[PDB]
Amino acid sequence: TALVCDNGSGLVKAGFAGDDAPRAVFPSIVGRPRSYVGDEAQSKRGILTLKYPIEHGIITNWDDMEKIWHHTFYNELRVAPEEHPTLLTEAPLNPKANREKMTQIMFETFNVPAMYVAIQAVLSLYASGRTTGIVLDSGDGVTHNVPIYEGYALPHAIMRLDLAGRDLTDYLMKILTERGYSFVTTAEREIVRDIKEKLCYVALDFENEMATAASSSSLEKSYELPDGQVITIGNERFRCPETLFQPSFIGMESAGIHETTYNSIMKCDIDIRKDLYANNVMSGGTTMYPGIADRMQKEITALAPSTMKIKIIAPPERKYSVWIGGSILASLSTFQQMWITKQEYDEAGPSIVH
Amino acid sequence: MQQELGLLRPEERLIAGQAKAAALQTVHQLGAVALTPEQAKAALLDEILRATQNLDLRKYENLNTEQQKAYEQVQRDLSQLSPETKALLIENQRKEKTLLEKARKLFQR
Numbered sequence: 013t014a015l016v017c018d019n020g021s022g023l024v025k026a027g028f029a030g031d032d033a034p035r036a037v038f039p040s041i042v043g044r045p046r047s048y049v050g051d052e053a054q055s056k057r058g059i060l061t062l063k064y065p066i067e068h069g070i071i072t073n074w075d076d077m078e079k080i081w082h083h084t085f086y087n088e089l090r091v092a093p094e095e096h097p098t099l100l101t102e103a104p105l106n107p108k109a110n111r112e113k114m115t116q117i118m119f120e121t122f123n124v125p126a127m128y129v130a131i132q133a134v135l136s137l138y139a140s141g142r143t144t145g146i147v148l149d150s151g152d153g154v155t156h157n158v159p160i161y162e163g164y165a166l167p168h169a170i171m172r173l174d175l176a177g178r179d180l181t182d183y184l185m186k187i188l189t190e191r192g193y194s195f196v197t198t199a200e201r202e203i204v205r206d207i208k209e210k211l212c213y214v215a216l217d218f219e220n221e222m223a224t225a226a227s228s229s230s231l232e233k234s235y236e237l238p239d240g241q242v243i244t245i246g247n248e249r250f251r252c253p254e255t256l257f258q259p260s261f262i263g264m265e266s267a268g269i270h271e272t273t274y275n276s277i278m279k280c281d282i283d284i285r286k287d288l289y290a291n292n293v294m295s296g297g298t299t300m301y302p303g304i305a306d307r308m309q310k311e312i313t314a315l316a317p318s319t320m321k322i323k324i325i326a327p328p329e330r331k332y333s334v335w336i337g338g339s340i341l342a343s344l345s346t347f348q349q350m351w352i353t354k355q356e357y358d359e360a361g362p363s364i365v366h
Numbered sequence: 367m368q369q370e371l372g373l374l375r376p377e378e379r380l381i382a383g384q385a386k387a388a389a390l391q392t393v394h395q396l397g398a399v400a401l402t403p404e405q406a407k408a409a410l411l412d413e414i415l416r417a418t419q420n421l422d423l424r425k426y427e428n429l430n431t432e433q434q435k436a437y438e439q440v441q442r443d444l445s446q447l448s449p450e451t452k453a454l455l456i457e458n459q460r461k462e463k464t465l466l467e468k469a470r471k472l473f474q475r
């Protein structure tokens with residue numbers, strides 16, 4: 013069958029088209045010593061030097077990406093690339109030189125029979141059962157607002173923000189450190205990330221939650237580290253994700269995710285705006301926070317025209333909506349004519365990925 | 367003159383014909399008489415909405431409740447106030463921030 017590989021800055025999600033979830037999720041890391049990939053690189057981090065091939069959504073080191081792909085096929089999925097068509101994903105605004113190099117490697121280093129490169133945000137939208145709306149995709153390395161009309165991502169209305177999962181982890185590390193604990197290394201990075209996913213949430217009104225959260229005997233929560241050690245965690249639960257709406261928290265002059273959404277909508281024809289406002293779809297691991305849908309509703313309502321219908325959609329599966337949408341798409345009959353093909357490849361070069 | 371209309375034979379009903387032939391088709395047709403890109407796109411978007419209308423994926427729910435429960439625990443308790451207690455708390459905190467700011471202004475100098 014067809015393979016579906018979602019190359020994220022933090023996590024690769026791979027599996028088989030038609031399946032309801034990936035079969036392999038693993039860090040997008042390559043380790044050489046002073047070559048290992050994935051979980052096996054996390055373990056041996058003392059000895060190994062770690063690199064990340066994918067930076068802010070975009071592949072920037074190809075050899076390590078070659079080891080990531082190699083790992084994916086053989087170790088994770090236990091297949092030959094020769095025998096399976098391959099769906100791959102790129103970040104919106106992926107430069108063309110990039111999608112072409114992706115295509116070449118697949119055809120000449122992996123000799124895949126067929127291939128395709130689809131836009132992550134577009135796959136999430138299809139996965140929500142829509143072909144028009146605006147997606148907010150936020151992962152580990154990048155956040156994008158992607159306006160989409162009838163299956164077409166409007167390249168000039170696309171908003172990018174280099175503030176995502178990893179920065180939030182790093183910010184929590186810092187504010188938990190300010191409190192008295194000590195989280196400064198990468199072997200402490202992966203610990204705090206787990207706290208973030210276990211206990212952080214998003215405040216509806218920030219000022220209000222600072223002034224009022226301390227009344228709940230539930231605000232402060234204990235968390236057992238691997239030391240057997242118990243630390244407490246309070247208002248840093250909502251101080252952490254608040255950076256998405258107030259990037260200044262980590263010295264970023266950039267505007268917050270609610271404003272980029274609005275800005276993005278405002279770069280589209282006034283006549284399709286009703287459609288975008290009512291189809292805000294969130295995807296990516298960093299949209300998991302409880303309270304995030306509600307806070308976006310309130311924020312968008314505040315920016316949008318007075319009588320405008322606003323509607324935030326947040327599917328329980330949004331950590332995976334990209335991989336899912338890739339598996340829906342690669343299963344479709346009407347889609348089968350769209351695979352780029354071995355034959356096609358050697359009579360147009362990589363340029364047939366335009 | 368009206369016979370220029372006669373030269374057009376509306377009675378052929380070739381639009382009728384092509385309409386009936388299109389209705390009977392399946393979302394994807396076999397035999398492979400290559401679709402132009404636009405036909406292919408329009409079919410794709412039709413099939414996408416179709417292969418999606420009834421797909422549930424509710425086996426993805428409550429895969430995150432520790433995070434979700436802890437949040438609710440808090441919002442439960444925090445509703446207990448009133449636009450007063452909290453307006454006066456926001457006003458209190460506000461005044462604190464000033465003192466707090468005036469504080470480290472003297473600190474590091």
Ligand SMILES: Nc1ncnc2c1ncn2[C@@H]1O[C@H](COP(=O)(O)OP(=O)(O)OP(=O)(O)O)[C@@H](O)[C@H]1O
Pocket residue numbers: 019020021022023024068069150151152153154155176177178205208209210295296297298299300301331430433
């Ligand atoms: N429940 C959760 N709450 C908050 N953050 C979460 C949660 N679950 C996962 N994350 C974060 O989401 C990120 C992973 O999301 P995802 O896999 O969508 O990104 P990616 O595809 O690897 O990176 P990108 O899309 O930015 O290139 C990590 O930062 C992870 O900590």
Ligand SMILES: [Ca+2]
Pocket residue numbers: 019020021132151296334
């Ligand atoms: Ca991603």
